[PDB]
Design a protein around this ligand. Structure first.
Ligand SMILES: O=C(O)c1ccccc1Nc1cc(Cl)cc(Cl)c1
Ligand SMILES: O=C(O)c1ccccc1Nc1cc(Cl)cc(Cl)c1
Lengths: 116, 116, 116, 116
């Protein structure tokens, strides 16, 4: 689909499974509106968040609930969640992958944006 | 001081200088309230955000305006900003350093928390 | 296969395509011996490096030729290559993914190790 | 001095203290020669590796013994060490900082290169 999220675990060397991911879109009135959400699969990936028809240009926030993930693994972590804010631009046909690599006191995120 | 932010640039191999950093605290009514802010120095570090008296337990967000930083370097980047949300807990005397390593489509952040 | 490498580009937000990857194994005499090698595909992934029969316990080094990759993109980077050294242990059936996220002056690497 | 190394711990949110760091230089015969080495201080930093007189252009490898560091903290990690290979070039007066952020299955490294 146009938007995928993948989450990896740097402490156990594994995909981060069953992580809640929320996508919000900035609405015309400058509030965050719920856009899509889901939980990562056993490969750490979350597919099927949205469709080409629903995913329009705008400012999006991807919120990953890293706190609940770590607690389910027996870890009480530093961050409340990991979040990523970015603009989706139509200049071409695009697909976005937001990936995050998690540790208890750190995270990395990157975006892969490709043209089909 | 109890809270320091440092920002590095992975494209030029340099501290990220003159980056705007905003700290917000969650208020009793669950909105973000401006708490402190500043701009990184030539070493990439932002000192003097707050004092021991002002920095209480709570939920804080550190927002780094990476978009303006990249544009001043001639780069139009992916993220709108980089932000870090975490709980400050009194269990002991603590000092927090929030560091971020920036690229145009990615960033890393980590926290260093030490007891003086 | 038991060993996969994936390489991402943090400057362009894209898989790192056609990157040379060399795998070495430490031999009984403590030299590095060429074990397997290949180039990443259009998805940034390198499959088919080795087989279950050939991939034994040992100490492996994965060397990614990031210098040639950046130069082909018009960038003269800091590192000569990115390399990752680790032990493969038989304690169970295992599959290893070595991933790397590249910038001109920085890189991240992580390992995903799963049991089929 | 012209070359500094700093090491941070993403699992405990702390500088990585007492970590052994080895610097090697490629000699005329294409072997690695020991150049300098030391152990990180309580701030995670290793100062005083070398002098302006000794630090010449060349190809250097910085090897961080992350395995012993994790084991002293009670963790049996994935990597044998973290290493960083790069060219030092005289085009100007330069100072190099090699920083590494460590987790049990991942690490990040970046370089900060500045002109005094
Ligand atoms: O992108 C992937 O599909 C992938 C798969 C396995 C491991 C890592 C992956 N990316 C990755 C994402 C971040 Cl944020 C950092 C790093 Cl070192 C790799
Ligand atoms: O923390 C420091 O003081 C520092 C100084 C120079 C370079 C890097 C530093 N940290 C660092 C921070 C992140 Cl987020 C990632 C990485 Cl590899 C290093």
């Amino acid at each position: 689909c146009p938007l995928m999220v993948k989450v990896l675990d740097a402490v156990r060397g594994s995909p981060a499974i069953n992580v809640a991911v929320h996508v919000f879109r900035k609405a015309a009135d400058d509030t965050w509106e719920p856009f899509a959400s889901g939980k990562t699969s056993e490969s750490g990936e979350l597919h099927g968040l949205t469709t080409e028809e629903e995913f329009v240009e705008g400012i999006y926030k991807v919120e990953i609930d890293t706190k609940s993930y770590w607690k389910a693994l027996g870890i009480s972590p530093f961050h409340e969640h990991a979040e990523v804010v970015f603009t989706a631009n139509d200049s071409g046909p695009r697909r976005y992958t937001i990936a995050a690599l998690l540790s208890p006191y750190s995270y990395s995120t990157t975006a892969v944006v490709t043209n089909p």
